[PDB]
Amino acid sequence: PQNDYIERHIKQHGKRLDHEERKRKREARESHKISERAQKLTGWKGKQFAKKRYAEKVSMRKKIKAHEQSKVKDALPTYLLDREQKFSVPLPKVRGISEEEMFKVIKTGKSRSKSWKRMITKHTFVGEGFTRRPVKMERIIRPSALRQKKANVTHPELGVTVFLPILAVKKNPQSPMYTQLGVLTKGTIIEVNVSELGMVTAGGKVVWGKYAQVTNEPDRDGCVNAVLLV
Amino acid sequence: MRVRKRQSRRTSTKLKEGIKKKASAHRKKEKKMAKKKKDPGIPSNFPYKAKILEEIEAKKMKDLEEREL
Amino acid sequence: VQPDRRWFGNTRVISQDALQHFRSALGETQKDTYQVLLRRNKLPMSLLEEKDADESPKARILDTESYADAFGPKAQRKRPRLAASNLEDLVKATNEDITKYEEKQVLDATLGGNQEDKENGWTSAAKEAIFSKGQSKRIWNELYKVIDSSDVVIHVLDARDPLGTRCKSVEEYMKKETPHKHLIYVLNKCDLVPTWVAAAWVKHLS
Amino acid sequence: MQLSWKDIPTVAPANDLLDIVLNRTQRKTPTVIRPGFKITRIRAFYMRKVKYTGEGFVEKFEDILKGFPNINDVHPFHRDLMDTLYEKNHYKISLAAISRAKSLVEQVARDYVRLLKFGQSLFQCKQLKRAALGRMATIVKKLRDPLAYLEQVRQHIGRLPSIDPNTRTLLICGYPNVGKSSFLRCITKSDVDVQPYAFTTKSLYVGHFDYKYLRFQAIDTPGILDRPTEEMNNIEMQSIYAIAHLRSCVLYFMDLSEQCGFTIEAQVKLFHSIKPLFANKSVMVVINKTDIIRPEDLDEERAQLLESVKEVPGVEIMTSSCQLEENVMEVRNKACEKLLASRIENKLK
Amino acid sequence: YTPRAVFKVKPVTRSSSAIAGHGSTILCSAFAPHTSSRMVTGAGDNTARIWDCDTQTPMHTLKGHYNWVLCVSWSPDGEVIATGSMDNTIRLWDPKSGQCLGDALRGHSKWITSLSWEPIHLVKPGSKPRLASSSKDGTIKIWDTVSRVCQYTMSGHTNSVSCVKWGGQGLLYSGSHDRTVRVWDINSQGRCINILKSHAHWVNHLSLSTDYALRIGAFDHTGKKPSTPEEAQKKALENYEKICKKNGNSEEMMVTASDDYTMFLWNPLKSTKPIARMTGHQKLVNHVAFSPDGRYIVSASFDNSIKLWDGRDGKFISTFRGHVASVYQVAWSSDCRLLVSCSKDTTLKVWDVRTRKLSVDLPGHKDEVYTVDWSVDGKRVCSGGKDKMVRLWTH
RNA sequence: GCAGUCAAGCGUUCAUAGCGACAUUGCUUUUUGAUUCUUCGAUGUCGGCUCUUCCUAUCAUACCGAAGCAGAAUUCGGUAA
RNA sequence: UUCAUCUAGACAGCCGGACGGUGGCCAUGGAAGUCGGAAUCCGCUAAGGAGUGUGUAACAACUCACCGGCCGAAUGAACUA
Numbered sequence A: 001p002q003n004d005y006i007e008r009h010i011k012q013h014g015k016r017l018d019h020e021e022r023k024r025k026r027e028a029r030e031s032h033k034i035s036e037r038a039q040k041l042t043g044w045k046g047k048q049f050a051k052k053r054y055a056e057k058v059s060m061r062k063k064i065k066a067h068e069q070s071k072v073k074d075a076l077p078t079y080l081l082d083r084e085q086k087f088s089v090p091l092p093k094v095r096g097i098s099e100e101e102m103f104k105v106i107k108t109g110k111s112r113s114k115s116w117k118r119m120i121t122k123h124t125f126v127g128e129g130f131t132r133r134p135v136k137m138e139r140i141i142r143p144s145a146l147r148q149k150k151a152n153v154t155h156p157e158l159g160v161t162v163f164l165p166i167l168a169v170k171k172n173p174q175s176p177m178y179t180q181l182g183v184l185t186k187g188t189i190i191e192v193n194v195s196e197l198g199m200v201t202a203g204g205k206v207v208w209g210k211y212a213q214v215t216n217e218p219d220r221d222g223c224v225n226a227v228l229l230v
Numbered sequence B: 001m002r003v004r005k006r007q008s009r010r011t012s013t014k015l016k017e018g019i020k021k022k023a024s025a026h027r028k029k030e031k032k033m034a035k036k037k038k039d040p041g042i043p044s045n046f047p048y049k050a051k052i053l054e055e056i057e058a059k060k061m062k063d064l065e066e067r068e069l
Numbered sequence C: 001v002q003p004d005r006r007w008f009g010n011t012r013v014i015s016q017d018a019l020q021h022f023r024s025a026l027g028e029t030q031k032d033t034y035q036v037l038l039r040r041n042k043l044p045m046s047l048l049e050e051k052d053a054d055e056s057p058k059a060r061i062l063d064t065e066s067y068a069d070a071f072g073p074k075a076q077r078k079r080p081r082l083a084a085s086n087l088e089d090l091v092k093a094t095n096e097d098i099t100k101y102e103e104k105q106v107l108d109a110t111l112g113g114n115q116e117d118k119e120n121g122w123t124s125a126a127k128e129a130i131f132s133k134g135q136s137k138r139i140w141n142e143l144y145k146v147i148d149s150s151d152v153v154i155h156v157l158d159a160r161d162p163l164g165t166r167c168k169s170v171e172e173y174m175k176k177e178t179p180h181k182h183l184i185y186v187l188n189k190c191d192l193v194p195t196w197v198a199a200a201w202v203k204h205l206s
Numbered sequence D: 001m002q003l004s005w006k007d008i009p010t011v012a013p014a015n016d017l018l019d020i021v022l023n024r025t026q027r028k029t030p031t032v033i034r035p036g037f038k039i040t041r042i043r044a045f046y047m048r049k050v051k052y053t054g055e056g057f058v059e060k061f062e063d064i065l066k067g068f069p070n071i072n073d074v075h076p077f078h079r080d081l082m083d084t085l086y087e088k089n090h091y092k093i094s095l096a097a098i099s100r101a102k103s104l105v106e107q108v109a110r111d112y113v114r115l116l117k118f119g120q121s122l123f124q125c126k127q128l129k130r131a132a133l134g135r136m137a138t139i140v141k142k143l144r145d146p147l148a149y150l151e152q153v154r155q156h157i158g159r160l161p162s163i164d165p166n167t168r169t170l171l172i173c174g175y176p177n178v179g180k181s182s183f184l185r186c187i188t189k190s191d192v193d194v195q196p197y198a199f200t201t202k203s204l205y206v207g208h209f210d211y212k213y214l215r216f217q218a219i220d221t222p223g224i225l226d227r228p229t230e231e232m233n234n235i236e237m238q239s240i241y242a243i244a245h246l247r248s249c250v251l252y253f254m255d256l257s258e259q260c261g262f263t264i265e266a267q268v269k270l271f272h273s274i275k276p277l278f279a280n281k282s283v284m285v286v287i288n289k290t291d292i293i294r295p296e297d298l299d300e301e302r303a304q305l306l307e308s309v310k311e312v313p314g315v316e317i318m319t320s321s322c323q324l325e326e327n328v329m330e331v332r333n334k335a336c337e338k339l340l341a342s343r344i345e346n347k348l349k
Numbered sequence E: 001y002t003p004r005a006v007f008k009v010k011p012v013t014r015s016s017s018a019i020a021g022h023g024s025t026i027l028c029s030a031f032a033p034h035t036s037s038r039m040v041t042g043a044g045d046n047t048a049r050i051w052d053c054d055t056q057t058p059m060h061t062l063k064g065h066y067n068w069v070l071c072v073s074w075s076p077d078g079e080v081i082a083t084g085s086m087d088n089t090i091r092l093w094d095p096k097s098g099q100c101l102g103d104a105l106r107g108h109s110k111w112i113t114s115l116s117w118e119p120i121h122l123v124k125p126g127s128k129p130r131l132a133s134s135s136k137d138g139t140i141k142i143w144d145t146v147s148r149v150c151q152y153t154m155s156g157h158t159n160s161v162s163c164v165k166w167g168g169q170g171l172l173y174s175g176s177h178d179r180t181v182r183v184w185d186i187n188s189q190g191r192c193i194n195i196l197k198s199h200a201h202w203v204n205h206l207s208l209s210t211d212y213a214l215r216i217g218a219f220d221h222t223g224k225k226p227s228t229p230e231e232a233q234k235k236a237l238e239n240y241e242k243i244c245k246k247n248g249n250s251e252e253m254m255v256t257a258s259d260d261y262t263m264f265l266w267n268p269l270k271s272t273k274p275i276a277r278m279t280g281h282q283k284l285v286n287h288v289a290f291s292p293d294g295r296y297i298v299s300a301s302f303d304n305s306i307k308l309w310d311g312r313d314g315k316f317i318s319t320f321r322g323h324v325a326s327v328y329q330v331a332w333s334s335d336c337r338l339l340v341s342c343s344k345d346t347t348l349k350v351w352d353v354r355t356r357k358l359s360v361d362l363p364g365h366k367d368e369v370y371t372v373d374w375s376v377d378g379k380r381v382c383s384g385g386k387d388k389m390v391r392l393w394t395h
Numbered sequence F: 001g002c003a004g005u006c007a008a009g010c011g012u013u014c015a016u017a018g019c020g021a022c023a024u025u026g027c028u029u030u031u032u033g034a035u036u037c038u039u040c041g042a043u044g045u046c047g048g049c050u051c052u053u054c055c056u057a058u059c060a061u062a063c064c065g066a067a068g069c070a071g072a073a074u075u076c077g078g079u080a081a
Numbered sequence G: 001u002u003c004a005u006c007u008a009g010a011c012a013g014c015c016g017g018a019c020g021g022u023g024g025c026c027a028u029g030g031a032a033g034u035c036g037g038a039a040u041c042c043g044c045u046a047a048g049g050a051g052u053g054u055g056u057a058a059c060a061a062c063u064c065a066c067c068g069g070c071c072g073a074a075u076g077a078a079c080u081a
């Protein structure tokens, strides 16, 4: 067999003597077999089937609305067109984190009796000269798996979002110690690079650092999602 | 024809009282959301599809007119 | 978060003349092993960096021939790009291509080989589980523990084979994730290497 | 590999790949965890989910990578063949997209597991599980177009024949409607079209035949029209690259009749035209369709055109009533024999 | 040594009075190619404004349009205003009167992107520079500007023909999203002569080495007011050979921008092959030009760059760091020792080609800027657009 | 996950007060299958002989369905412990 | 429950027409409604799309959407419970 061999075969010999009255009856019977599979098919095959059929009916409704609309009947420049993309902070009143969440304890000794060590459990930001401090003296631990050096921050305008390195953190509600520590819980306002969004004011030298508030717990996921305040 | 286990439909008093508590908290939360008309008129298919609005207009030519005088 | 004029108060602007001033010493700055780096006083990379490349970034074709025109029953293309014209130059290409395929064929024929052994059917055994004594995660753990708890790192080589006991692939990570540690080298057990090689092996690595 | 790659599994479209791998991680892992168990047990539950899903995707992709024939650096004939066939550009860039996606999902898993070993409650870890799995899902959902392309390239290249580049060959070429496939079907066991229309084939068809207890492959090509090497087709550049790379005898097919709907002067024009690709072949042409015309009555310009044919080092104008199967054998033995001289004069150094 | 295109224009530094007007988003503004005062602006609506830079008042606004007008390029006599409008039609005008001259330009199908005119020293002294309008639909209609009807459309491109120019050898230059260049002539009457196939993604901003002069219409380094059309065309051919006689002959260079970064300079007259593989960008390049004295090629792009090349082959000369965003529309000075360039953001950054530095900045809108042109004495620029502010410049 | 567009339909009738499914749009490092010689803190102890049974969320074995499935070999799916 | 059609014959069925200007224009080896892009005209009509699909390498041929002949009474659609 070299090329389109089944098609050469179909044109030379044909199909089964009954491939037409089987296809026809299969079709006419699929209308019955759809309801059978909907009143049977227990347990997550029924969920997949129902969601799939909802998708289908949605698509068909989309299509027929579109066809009847087809039956009824800004101003970018040339160097640009045909290309496609109070003083209230958007987020006061975030929930409060007790000092038992976001502070885990680390008992020390084969006889676990002399703990004195704590471990931050929320995603932090550590800076640029982290360089972990000696084991005998360190009392707060922000483990390396929970660290961040950038944040995925969007813009109110331009309809954009970019990954920007986190320069430093300014305001962490519900503690000043959390701010000194650089813990990135939701609501915190971090000072992030903004070079790529490229803004110039009157005179407008150029800005390469801005303020932005985070809007998702970096624990229910790993990402940091923040939004800019133009 | 192997028959596989069927779920029991008994009580589980722990679960029954849990249902009471869940339902009550849900009602209260509903009342939180609670603290925060195109009347149908006339059904069709009626046989006396003539006399009705006629009687309403017989009323209205009086309810309007017994304001002025 | 109490309302403020910050937060909508811009923070970290920088000037034409500052970019002009500091884009200027990158092709100058006097760095030797007799001077190490301590601080940063961070400066805007995305603007101060990025020397020129003259390589013609690879063209893109996606937005011009999607997929269903490329191949498939749609196949909205029949004639090639760039539709070679010079027949003599083309047969030049194709004959030199077969001969050069023969050149690579003889590269592999000379170097190897394993095809005769795999036609005999046998294969080399399992390299022992002892030959994984340094590449355990229990070990690389403590490794990064000291990389992170260290203010600087000393990568001890041995004098008799530095080129074989470096095998770095860790300095690539170090320079980029924590540049402020400078990877001193000590070529240990030197005496087993005479003073002559004790100079040769440092002269081209310092 | 080589020689009619038919060993590539199947590229399920992106929604089906999502279904397959996710349903698989749902079935072949424990699915009952309770808030009450040790936090170690919860972390382990969700870690295993994420790592397993990652592995599943990675094997689904690694299979495709290790399977596809790797267009560049195989053999110039096949390289240019899949060029003219499946768009070398698109090919390489799609497979590269797949490799990038494989790396991406490995990274997704290897980050979210390092995270999960720090989760502190069933809900935190369940959220991490959903998060990593959803990120892998979009990573794969991106792969709509590459996979839809790869399915058809696979179902095509699988069918695609296998001609050894170096064994004794016999190329058959010329204009449409002349008799390429007539000769092939009449000489060797194959099934190639004969119907009276122009492009009676659309790709390279093969047929083996024996001679001196040895194996000789014969290759019918679609053919070429005028096409001054600027405008061509994927139909024509296949014959182009064939007559280029494959080094054996060639049979140019023309005619002097009412069929073969061009002009004889255009036929010899194309002969002169493809003369540049007749380098090391020792052509034999065939004055064909010689059953009723008795073509000894060809005019003086045809005489001059065959004089031009007799410029090449090794030439042969020969008649053949290609349906009188008792001369097609003389033609086959003649040509292959006059080839064996040069073939062995290579083999003996 | 080197020539000068001899003149001296001081380094521009002054935003003049930023002017209000019709509060929409300007796209393209055209200057009077003889006197250095008059700007015309079809903003983000149907209407069109005319203003002066030296009295800073609305110079008899050119109203009277029903749909969006797009791309305004001035005639070479200061008597005709054809204006790109995205509808299928166009309207003709004149600034001095600012009245309705005729009616629509029927026939087109989508937006009219670039406008061309006759070369000056070529056509009869006392004539009408005809036009070959383009569209988004690949058409090219050659109107005798008086009849404003075309006889023969030539259809080499199937893509969106966005660039039109008429070179001074009776030549043409058309440009479309087909990634390919097609040049015709006048004695064709429905024919294509020069088909150049280079790029893998489409073209943008087909350039010209005669653009400055053959859009000014024979005015000097001082920009007088001539009388005789014969001597005006003399001045045209004279400054022609003043600027284009680099290699002793006026072989019309053609360097067309691209997407694929294949930045290619050409010479259509005596060849089809290209010349200059002057690549190096990272993102899409949009704006390019030849220096007035044809001496170099300037390329500004979407990758924070500015490049000047060898105006003799297309060899690299200089690249000028110092940006944040894309670089849209770039206009030439008269001294040719200086450059202005509109970045994506507010600023309009200015340059130093004589010694290859940045001269200064000039910010002051509070939105995006679009248009940059030049005054016919090398003094002024008008720059309006998305900021709704037609900020005016001077030195 | 975050920031939006939708907009099915719902909302003292309220689309332009409001919501709002399925869809969708944005990177989290690049486009030619390049490498991968980059593994990052489990606060609580883990891992193994003999042995039995149960679940199905099936790897093999049985029987079927759809796949360019020629043959061969698979891929996916159904009943099935 | 809100909507229409219907003996100036409703629904389901058979049977008949489903046409000229016009292989509409581009693109090509062929693309005659049915690989592909751009609108969608008029004519005489009862209707008839510059064509719903199966089909041919290219038309044919079948079909639908659309009309009419036969029959002779409800049927259609969308929501709520």
Ligand SMILES: Nc1nc2c(ncn2[C@@H]2O[C@H](COP(=O)(O)OP(=O)(O)OP(=O)(O)O)[C@@H](O)[C@H]2O)c(=O)[nH]1
Binding pocket: D175, D176, D177, D178, D179, D180, D181, D182, D183, D192, D193, D194, D195, D196, D197, D198, D199, D200, D201, D202, D220, D221, D222, D223, D259, D288, D289, D290, D291, D320, D321, D322, D323, D324
């Ligand atoms: N009577 C006769 N007719 C011949 C002879 N040789 C060729 N022909 C004619 O050539 C036709 C053969 O058609 P094909 O072999 O398919 O030629 P083709 O169309 O170029 O074939 P492909 O290139 O594979 O598509 C026959 O039907 C004959 O009409 C011959 O020897 N005698």
Ligand SMILES: [Mg+2]
Binding pocket: D177, D178, D179, D181, D182, D193, D194, D195, D196, D197, D200
């Ligand atoms: Mg034939």
